[PDB]
Amino acid sequence: KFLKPGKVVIVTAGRYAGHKAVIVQNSDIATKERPYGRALLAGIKKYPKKVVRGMSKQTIARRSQVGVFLRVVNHKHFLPTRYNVDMSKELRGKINVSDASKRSRSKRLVRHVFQARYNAGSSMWFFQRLRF
Amino acid sequence: IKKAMRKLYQVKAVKVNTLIRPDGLKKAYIRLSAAHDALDTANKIGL
Amino acid sequence: GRGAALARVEFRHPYKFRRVKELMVAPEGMFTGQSVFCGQKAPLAIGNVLPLGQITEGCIVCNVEAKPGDRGTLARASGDYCIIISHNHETGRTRLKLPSGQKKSVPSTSRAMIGIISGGGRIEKPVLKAGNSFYRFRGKRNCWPKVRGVARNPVEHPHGGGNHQHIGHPSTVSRHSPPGQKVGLIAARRTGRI
Amino acid sequence: WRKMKEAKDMGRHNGVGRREGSREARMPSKELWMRRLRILRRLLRKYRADKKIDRHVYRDLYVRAKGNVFRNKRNLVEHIHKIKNEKKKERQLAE
Amino acid sequence: SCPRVQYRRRMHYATRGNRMMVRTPGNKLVMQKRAKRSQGIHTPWVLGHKRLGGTKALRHIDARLASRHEKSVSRAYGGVLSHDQVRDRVVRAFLVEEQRIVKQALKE
Amino acid sequence: PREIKTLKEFLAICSRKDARCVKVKHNPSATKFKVRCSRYLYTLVVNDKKKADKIERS
Amino acid sequence: KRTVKMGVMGRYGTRYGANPRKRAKKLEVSQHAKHFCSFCGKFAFRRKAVGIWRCDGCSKTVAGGAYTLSTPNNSTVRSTVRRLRELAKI
RNA sequence: GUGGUAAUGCGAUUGCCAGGUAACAAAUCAAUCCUCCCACGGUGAGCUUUCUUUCACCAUAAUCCAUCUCCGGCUUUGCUGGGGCUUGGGCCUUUUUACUUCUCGCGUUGUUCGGGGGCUCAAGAUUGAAAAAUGCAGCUCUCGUACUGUUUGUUGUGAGUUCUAUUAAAGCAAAAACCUGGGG
RNA sequence: UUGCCACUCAGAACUGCUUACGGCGGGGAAUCCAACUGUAUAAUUAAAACAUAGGUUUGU
RNA sequence: UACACGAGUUGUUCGGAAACUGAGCACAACGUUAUAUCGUUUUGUUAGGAAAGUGAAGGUGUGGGCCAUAACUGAAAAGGGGCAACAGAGAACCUGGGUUAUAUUCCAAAAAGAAAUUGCAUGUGG
Numbered sequence A: 001k002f003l004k005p006g007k008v009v010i011v012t013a014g015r016y017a018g019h020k021a022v023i024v025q026n027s028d029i030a031t032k033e034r035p036y037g038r039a040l041l042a043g044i045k046k047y048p049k050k051v052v053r054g055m056s057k058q059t060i061a062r063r064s065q066v067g068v069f070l071r072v073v074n075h076k077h078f079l080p081t082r083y084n085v086d087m088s089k090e091l092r093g094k095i096n097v098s099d100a101s102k103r104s105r106s107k108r109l110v111r112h113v114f115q116a117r118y119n120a121g122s123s124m125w126f127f128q129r130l131r132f
Numbered sequence B: 001i002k003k004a005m006r007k008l009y010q011v012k013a014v015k016v017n018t019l020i021r022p023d024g025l026k027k028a029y030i031r032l033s034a035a036h037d038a039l040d041t042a043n044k045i046g047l
Numbered sequence C: 001g002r003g004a005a006l007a008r009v010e011f012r013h014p015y016k017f018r019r020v021k022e023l024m025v026a027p028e029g030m031f032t033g034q035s036v037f038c039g040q041k042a043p044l045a046i047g048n049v050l051p052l053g054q055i056t057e058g059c060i061v062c063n064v065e066a067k068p069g070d071r072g073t074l075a076r077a078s079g080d081y082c083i084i085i086s087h088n089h090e091t092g093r094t095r096l097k098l099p100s101g102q103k104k105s106v107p108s109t110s111r112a113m114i115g116i117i118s119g120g121g122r123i124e125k126p127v128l129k130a131g132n133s134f135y136r137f138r139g140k141r142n143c144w145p146k147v148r149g150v151a152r153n154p155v156e157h158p159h160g161g162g163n164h165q166h167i168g169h170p171s172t173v174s175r176h177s178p179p180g181q182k183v184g185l186i187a188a189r190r191t192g193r194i
Numbered sequence D: 001w002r003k004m005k006e007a008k009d010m011g012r013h014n015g016v017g018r019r020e021g022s023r024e025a026r027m028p029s030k031e032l033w034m035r036r037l038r039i040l041r042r043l044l045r046k047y048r049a050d051k052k053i054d055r056h057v058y059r060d061l062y063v064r065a066k067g068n069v070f071r072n073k074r075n076l077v078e079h080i081h082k083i084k085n086e087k088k089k090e091r092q093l094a095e
Numbered sequence E: 001s002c003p004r005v006q007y008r009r010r011m012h013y014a015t016r017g018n019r020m021m022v023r024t025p026g027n028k029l030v031m032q033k034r035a036k037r038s039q040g041i042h043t044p045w046v047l048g049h050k051r052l053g054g055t056k057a058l059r060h061i062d063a064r065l066a067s068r069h070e071k072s073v074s075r076a077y078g079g080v081l082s083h084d085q086v087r088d089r090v091v092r093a094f095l096v097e098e099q100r101i102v103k104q105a106l107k108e
Numbered sequence F: 001p002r003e004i005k006t007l008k009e010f011l012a013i014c015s016r017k018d019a020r021c022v023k024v025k026h027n028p029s030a031t032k033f034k035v036r037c038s039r040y041l042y043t044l045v046v047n048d049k050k051k052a053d054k055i056e057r058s
Numbered sequence G: 001k002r003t004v005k006m007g008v009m010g011r012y013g014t015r016y017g018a019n020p021r022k023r024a025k026k027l028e029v030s031q032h033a034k035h036f037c038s039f040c041g042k043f044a045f046r047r048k049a050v051g052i053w054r055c056d057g058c059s060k061t062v063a064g065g066a067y068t069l070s071t072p073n074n075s076t077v078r079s080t081v082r083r084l085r086e087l088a089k090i
Numbered sequence H: 001g002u003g004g005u006a007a008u009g010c011g012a013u014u015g016c017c018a019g020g021u022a023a024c025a026a027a028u029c030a031a032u033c034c035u036c037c038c039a040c041g042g043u044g045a046g047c048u049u050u051c052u053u054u055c056a057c058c059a060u061a062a063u064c065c066a067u068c069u070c071c072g073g074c075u076u077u078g079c080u081g082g083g084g085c086u087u088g089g090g091c092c093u094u095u096u097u098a099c100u101u102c103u104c105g106c107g108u109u110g111u112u113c114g115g116g117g118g119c120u121c122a123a124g125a126u127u128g129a130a131a132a133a134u135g136c137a138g139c140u141c142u143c144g145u146a147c148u149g150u151u152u153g154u155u156g157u158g159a160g161u162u163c164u165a166u167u168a169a170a171g172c173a174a175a176a177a178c179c180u181g182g183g184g
Numbered sequence I: 001u002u003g004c005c006a007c008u009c010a011g012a013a014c015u016g017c018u019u020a021c022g023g024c025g026g027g028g029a030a031u032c033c034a035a036c037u038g039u040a041u042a043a044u045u046a047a048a049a050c051a052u053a054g055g056u057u058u059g060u
Numbered sequence J: 001u002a003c004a005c006g007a008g009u010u011g012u013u014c015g016g017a018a019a020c021u022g023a024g025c026a027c028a029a030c031g032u033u034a035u036a037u038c039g040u041u042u043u044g045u046u047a048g049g050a051a052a053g054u055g056a057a058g059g060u061g062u063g064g065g066c067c068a069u070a071a072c073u074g075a076a077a078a079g080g081g082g083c084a085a086c087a088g089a090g091a092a093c094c095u096g097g098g099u100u101a102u103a104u105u106c107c108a109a110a111a112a113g114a115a116a117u118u119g120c121a122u123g124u125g126g
């Protein structure tokens, strides 16, 4: 209703304190390792720096990357917003599981998506920097 | 004073403590690197 | 050495990239984090510095400035303020009433805060002791205590002297009198208790 | 000195004519309250572990530690015994 | 045998800077300076002057050489701002651009 | 001064190039290995017959 | 009920006369009195300096009033502003 | 650069801007410190017609290392994490307080937060290194010669730490260097 | 539920000084002057003088 | 503590300066003055044109570029310098001991030891 998967938020109150990040899997109540609302989400540690439009070269690749983290952040540490990314909560929202040995390869696909979805014109907002 | 020692008395100097005495004259104590015996220079320098 | 609170207001430097910091006298009510506007099209909330000929008439303005640019002179001690009386848009000059009754005319492009200067009602709490007057002037200049010139010797003051402490000649001295003589009631035009 | 220090811990202390400073200067007034009030609080925090209700039978009385109505640690414990009983007697006569 | 002591250094004044009294392994009781323990890293005085957590109160010498992660958390505005003054600064950095681009653009 | 909590790292940092001296120590309840590097002295205190072993060669 | 007639001014005793003590007592009792902050809601303003009031519970410093929070001519000024804003806009 | 829902952890850099430290009058109050006392136990010398034990000594520097294991598991081959010392703080997470409750401090007050775990913070202890060959010192004997002891607990007062009350028409310096961050 | 680490006060008798280091306000009644703490004629004047708070005035 | 002779003061770390600012000072400039040794002068000077800190193309050993120092330019950058604190700020060292008199100053190699620290260097870690 508010925290649907595929909806972008701002990861308040953490190492990534002002970053924009999309929910890919929310939760309600876990037993002992998450008494809190458990919206797993992937988001940006490395924003693609502004396209210089000058020396259009591999430096445009070295300065348009998207580094991605996956964390199951409590709900009182988000800030939901109006937007979405529609990053396949039913197609990609399940091949990105969080168990060990997955955060190795599962992380590199939601990264592998932001690679192309920024190189293509989709949001042009989610990939800015929240200036504060 | 170290350079001068080595240039005058071909011995090494480690610690050169100085002091301007109450005569306007600057004394100098000079450790001789423990490898040049001092008692073999005062006998050479003729002290 | 001042009864009025000084509010540190920061603005952005319009030209460089800094944040220039401005020290202003604080109109009463102005609190930390109020987002003060000081320009032409500024709103007229209690603390803004919208221009004087653009403030509505009959309003209440402190920290008004006489010349257009001198950065605030008039109505600037604690609790003091001016009331705008008249605008003369043909002349372009506003007549505001200074916090002394003496109402003057200033140009309608001067700036002025909106409100009363902070620290109002300072002068009503009596001092009750010479020591609270000591600490008042130790932030202010060095004029305390005031020895009465009639208690001085007739070398150091025109009043001093005599076997009795009396002012020998009338205290009201001329406007034109030389300095060192212009002591007492200077050019007193109305004298004594009313 | 230890002849007096031996004869001044169990008895034979100063007397009406040995005192030379006011009692609030010999045995301070502000510290016979202080300690005697640490004790009435070091005892009521002891009695939030497993003792009586500790919400309105602690702070109904936490301000009576600082109201000079209990004049000793012992003087405190009968007052909570006078109330703990009808705190379990009113809980007994209930039908 | 109750020895008294000296100000060992050349300053023999009891300013809040010296504040020196320790027993010695030679039992030659003699007194040494302290460091003036500085208050630690704080938020700005304007923003509720408070000590920052995760930061130390190192002096000019300890601070000039110790690692950088002894004086700043890994957030944004870490070591200048506390989590209180970050989380409120991120919603105000976003609830404003939200109330802007809907209300600065309502003119078709 | 640091106290090497190792038999490998010690025998590494003890067999280094500085090695101003290695003062063999005997004290009650232990046996202590003072290597004197140029800027520290690294100790390895031990409670075992391993003292006399690494004493002959080190 | 200590000090039945002259209160805060008990600091002085016989000195300074009755009416200067009484005129200064009205203003000494208010600068130490906590005031209300239309911000936090609860009474929290102390008087960290003349014409300066701070609210620990609110963490914000209002300026104004030497021995009270709002001089009762600012009480009129504060309205005339919006009086001459709102009615002078609508 | 990478981890913990989060407090925040960890790893090896050159110009602007923004902060911070430097940087703060005195108070009252609780542990280290040191001083002194007492109970200790140990050493030396004193008193002795008597009467008895009096007095002395018993020390641990800067700078460091890590909280030993309670426990996983009482050491299989030892994991899931090598966390812990406490009391003052500031917070974090998770469940609550509205019948006025409650949390307070010696004290003028906090909530509109109440418990369970965590994250740090500065005092401060602790083991370990320094560090005992040092040092104080007695000794069995004869500057040589050796070794036998290398002890902490209690109180009280104090200086700083603790809590940026009170007089304030008194509100109780500034700056470099340094530090962190935003942009890089 | 009676175990171990506190010198403060209170009372009792007992006895003996009505004789006991040191340190430690004489008090009351008034009149006058200045309200007060304060300052001040270093080397004869500490006051009732100055200051002072308060009150008023004048200029601006 | 006289007279005579002889000696005696040891520092990477202590104090000071190099290197902070305060009350304040006032060189310059500028003004004024017959005249200055006068006045202004950091809450920032001056009718007022008050400065290499960086980044660079090109130059250079050599199989025309691998790579490297350097020259001499000159990138924005407002607010001239400069003093003034042996109690403010700041400040990298602690014990043990062997002078007739110095020691947080001296001790030499089982440094009597143990540290911290600045500069430049070689090199193991990426």
Ligand SMILES: [Mg+2]
Binding pocket: C154, C155, C157, C158
């Ligand atoms: Mg005359």
Ligand SMILES: [Mg+2]
Binding pocket: C158, C169
């Ligand atoms: Mg005359």
Ligand SMILES: [Mg+2]
Binding pocket: E039, E040, E042
């Ligand atoms: Mg501070």
Ligand SMILES: [Mg+2]
Binding pocket: H023
């Ligand atoms: Mg400060």
Ligand SMILES: [Mg+2]
Binding pocket: none
């Ligand atoms: Mg105590």
Ligand SMILES: [Mg+2]
Binding pocket: none
């Ligand atoms: Mg500064």
Ligand SMILES: [Mg+2]
Binding pocket: none
């Ligand atoms: Mg002589």
Ligand SMILES: [Mg+2]
Binding pocket: none
């Ligand atoms: Mg001149």
